[PDB]
Design a protein around this ligand. Structure first.
Ligand code: 865
Ligand SMILES: OC[C@H]1O[C@H](O[C@H]2[C@H](O)[C@@H](O)[C@@H](O)O[C@@H]2CO)[C@H](O)[C@@H](O)[C@@H]1O
Length: 513
């Protein structure tokens, strides 16, 4: 599928892709290999679907948070730089691109949101979020506004949400512990909704609108990353970059991202990509080429970062980064981001209340792990005859009651559909972990076809248990957990919006009560 003898690269439209293409030209001048740089819309969504079919770019650029999902899906090639190259980058940047013990990408730069303010409108930036309403009122009398930033991406709103105690996954990570719906998160989002209620912000303000307003000098402040600095320079706005405002006396905690370059598992040009990334991009001159297009932030390369660190704007970036947290790269990050995105937009527009919106975001973020906990335990206890003695953990009553519901209803299905299941089992012929990996396509084909209800979900899991008993019987018990993860993946991927609308596994319990 992917063409040999050339390099195709994907990077976001807000990054210095003209600078990157110029690095690609130097690579072409040396090697005779053409390098095509593209910046397609929603590439972070497009990549996992096209790469799965063996297609897509040789190299994909994104923040490290999305890269665990890719690797888990077998979409990323394991990268193996020698010691000499590894020592040229900061170790913690390597940490951000490590997944299950393996390095799955090259770290490029460290990104953190900062407060960007117009020094001509606002000689001193506000230290607190609380004082911004009164500041806006003051600025409105001059035909200006205080603050405008992207409200369509939760990335920009998260620092405020996390300030008073809101969090994604509790940190060792406890993935079952999601704090998107606690008091702190409610406090942060409410303050944002109130800003909109009191005409201090507009719910439909996106990236382009916020950037245009600041760079034209219509609003005193914005919230953005280093990549935005270029266009602000062009606009000749007397701007400064500083620490984010505190909320309730506590610092804003932005999720910190490490711009990373991954190599497609289906790429026939893995050696070319490695050569490009190591010996052309991750150099003083290579990063400078991109940085001069759009600023990268604090780059992973020590030799170049030592120079950039002298920039007050970089100092402000790293200060904000220190008060924030490095994003997790667990596969669930995509689901978390989608849930929180919807929650922020819905609360901002009044479609839901803060309590309602964050409630759904909680259910959406927990959905995979909670589903896995239930499906894994059912499959394993059915196969072995004995239950799991371990505590259910967070949201334990839900998991426990769902499992008990599943036991009652699942056993009925397996009983009544026994002959049908045995016929299906024989046709699939499942005898090792290799065969279990093949099931994903067949499973998705049958399940996603037709209507949606709890009954089909029970059938899905019950046949999974039926297969699990077969796997155990033929001494393939090690294949049960991969099967459980596979089924769980299919379920939450295909019925994500439906499950959330049913209030998750609580809905399942109530439905069969
Ligand atoms: C129970 C039944 C009766 C008649 N035809 C059937 N069957 C259908 C296709 N293959 C077998 C089935 C049937 C057999 C096995 C599973 C299902 C499912 C769940 C969706 C896919 O489940 C899996 C497929 C392949 C491997 C799997 C490994 C582990 C766990 C699940 C696996 C359904 C369903 O989605 O409702 N059905 C019923 C079904 O799809 N029908 C087709 C339309 N008319 C009613 C029956 C399962
Ligand atoms: O808004 C959710 C989004 O946040 C992050 O995306 C950032 C990205 O890290 C930055 O480099 C820049 O492009 O802004 C983006 C926000 O629009 C996460 O990396 C991403 O996974 C997540 O969906």
């Amino acid at each position: 599928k992917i063409e040999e003898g050339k390099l195709v690269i994907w990077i976001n439209g807000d990054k210095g892709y003209n600078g990157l293409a110029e690095v690609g030209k130097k690579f072409e001048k040396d090697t005779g290999i053409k390098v095509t740089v593209e910046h397609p819309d929603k590439l972070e969504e497009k990549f996992p679907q096209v790469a799965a079919t063996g297609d897509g770019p040789d190299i994909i650029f994104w923040a490290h948070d999305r890269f665990g999902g890719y690797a888990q899906s077998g979409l990323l090639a394991e990268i193996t730089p020698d010691k000499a190259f590894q020592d040229k980058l900061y170790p913690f940047t390597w940490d951000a691109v490590r997944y299950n013990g393996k390095l799955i990408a090259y770290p490029i730069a460290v990104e953190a949101l900062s407060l960007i303010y117009n020094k001509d409108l606002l000689p001193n930036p506000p230290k607190t979020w609380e004082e911004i309403p009164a500041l806006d009122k003051e600025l409105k009398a001059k035909g200006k506004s205080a603050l405008m930033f992207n409200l369509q991406e939760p990335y920009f709103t998260w620092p405020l949400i996390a300030a008073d105690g809101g969090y994604a996954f509790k940190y060792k990570y406890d993935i079952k512990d999601v704090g998107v719906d606690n008091a702190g998160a409610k406090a942060g989002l409410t303050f944002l909704v109130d800003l909109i209620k009191n005409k201090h912000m507009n719910a439909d303000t996106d990236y382009s609108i916020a950037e245009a307003a600041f760079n034209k000098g219509e609003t005193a402040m914005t919230i953005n990353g280093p990549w935005a600095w270029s266009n602000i320079d062009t606009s000749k706005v007397n701007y400064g970059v500083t620490v984010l405002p505190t909320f309730k006396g506590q610092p804003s905690k932005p999720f910190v991202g490490v711009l990373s370059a991954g190599i497609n598992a289906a790429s026939p040009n893995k050696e070319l990509a490695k050569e490009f990334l190591e010996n052309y991009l991750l150099t003083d001159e290579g990063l400078e080429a991109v940085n001069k297009d759009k600023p990268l932030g604090a780059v992973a390369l020590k030799s170049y970062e030592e120079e950039l660190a002298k920039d007050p704007r970089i100092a402000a970036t790293m200060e904000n980064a220190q008060k924030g947290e490095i994003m997790p790269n667990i596969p669930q990050m995509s689901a978390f981001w989608y849930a929180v995105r919807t929650a922020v937009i819905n609360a901002a527009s009044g479609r839901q209340t803060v309590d309602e919106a964050l409630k759904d975001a909680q259910t959406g973020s927990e959905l995979y792990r909670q589903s896995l906990e239930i499906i894994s335990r059912y499959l394993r206890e059915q196969a072995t005859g004995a239950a799991d003695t371990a505590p259910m953990g967070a949201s334990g009553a839900t998991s426990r009651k769902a499992l008990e519901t599943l036991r009652r209803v699942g056993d009925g299905v397996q009983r009544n559909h026994e002959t049908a299941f045995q016929g299906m089992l024989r046709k699939l012929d499942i005898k090792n972990e290799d065969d279990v990996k093949s099931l994903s396509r067949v499973m998705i084909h049958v399940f996603s076809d037709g209507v949606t209800n709890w009954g089909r979900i029970v059938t899905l899991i019950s046949f999974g248990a039926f297969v699990a008993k077969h796997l155990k019987t033929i001494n393939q018990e090690s294949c049960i957990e991969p099967l459980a993860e596979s089924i769980t993946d299919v379920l939450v991927r295909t019925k994500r919006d439906w499950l959330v609308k049913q209030r998750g596994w609580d809905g399942f319990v109530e439905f069969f009560h």
